Write an enzyme that holds these catalytic residues in place. Structure first.
Site, PDB file in Angstrom:
ATOM      1  N   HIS A   1      52.167  65.118  -1.403  1.00 27.92           N
ATOM      2  CA  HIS A   1      51.675  66.361  -0.815  1.00 27.92           C
ATOM      3  C   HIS A   1      52.528  66.772   0.384  1.00 27.92           C
ATOM      4  O   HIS A   1      53.457  66.064   0.762  1.00 27.92           O
ATOM      5  CB  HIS A   1      50.213  66.213  -0.386  1.00 27.92           C
ATOM      6  CG  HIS A   1      49.245  66.202  -1.528  1.00 27.92           C
ATOM      7  ND1 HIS A   1      47.925  65.827  -1.381  1.00 27.92           N
ATOM      8  CD2 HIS A   1      49.399  66.525  -2.832  1.00 27.92           C
ATOM      9  CE1 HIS A   1      47.314  65.916  -2.545  1.00 27.92           C
ATOM     10  NE2 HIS A   1      48.185  66.338  -3.445  1.00 27.92           N
TER      11      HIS A   1
ATOM     12  N   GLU B   1      51.491  66.898   3.390  1.00 23.41           N
ATOM     13  CA  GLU B   1      51.121  66.009   4.486  1.00 23.41           C
ATOM     14  C   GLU B   1      52.018  64.777   4.510  1.00 23.41           C
ATOM     15  O   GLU B   1      52.478  64.355   5.573  1.00 23.41           O
ATOM     16  CB  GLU B   1      49.654  65.583   4.359  1.00 23.41           C
ATOM     17  CG  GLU B   1      48.632  66.687   4.637  1.00 23.41           C
ATOM     18  CD  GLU B   1      48.467  67.658   3.479  1.00 23.41           C
ATOM     19  OE1 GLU B   1      49.185  67.521   2.469  1.00 23.41           O
ATOM     20  OE2 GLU B   1      47.613  68.562   3.582  1.00 23.41           O
TER      21      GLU B   1
END
Ligand SMILES: [Zn+2]
Length: 178
Positions: free
Chosen positions: A54, A56
């Site tokens: 992701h 993140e």
């Protein structure tokens, strides 16, 4: 790995705070960062992250490999399109707990599509580790337009429902946290 700014249409599309709106199959992460010891900030960095792992994890990878120094502090702020998923959220709070020279503030344009109790816990594990979680408001969208978008010096045009959607989102977020 990260980008400097993003195309205006990517901003208006992925950062519209329509709580329930598919078409946003990616997760975008605008960040700003202040590196500092015990005086004033000696440097800083901003940029954008997309999902490609992701967004993140693409941050924590880039951050750790290129920036994190054990004898320096880091004031990080995130502006995410979707709120962090349970898996990434747990991996951030685990990073936060092991690296005390890093402080994170997460502002999200949206929470989640469904009421996953899983996701409410990662959002809580984050808060328990000293991270600051909030919903993006007009000033935050305005700030992301001026700092992370090739805006061509055009003003931020807010969409219909901005304040109303944020109000419903900030309500649900506060119930999660307390
Ligand atoms: Zn995630």
């Amino acid at each position: 790995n990260p980008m400097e700014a993003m195309d205006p249409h990517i901003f208006y599309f992925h950062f519209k705070n329509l709580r329930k709106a598919y078409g946003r199959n990616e997760s975008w992460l605008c960040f700003t960062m202040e590196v500092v010891k015990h005086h004033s900030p000696v440097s800083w960095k901003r940029g954008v992250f997309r999902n490609q792992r992701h967004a993140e994890r693409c941050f924590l990878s880039w951050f750790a490999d290129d920036i994190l120094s054990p004898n320096t502090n880091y004031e990080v702020t995130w502006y995410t399109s979707w709120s962090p998923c349970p898996e990434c959220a747990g991996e951030v709070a685990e990073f936060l707990a092991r690296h005390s020279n890093v402080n994170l503030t997460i502002k999200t344009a949206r929470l989640y599509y469904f009421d996953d109790t899983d996701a409410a816990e990662g959002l809580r594990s984050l808060s328990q580790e000293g991270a600051s979680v909030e919903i993006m408001g007009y000033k935050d969208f305005k700030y992301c337009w001026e700092n992370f978008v090739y805006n061509d010096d055009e003003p931020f045009k807010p969409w219909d429902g901005l304040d109303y959607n944020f109000l419903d989102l900030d309500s649900k977020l506060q119930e999660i946290l307390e």
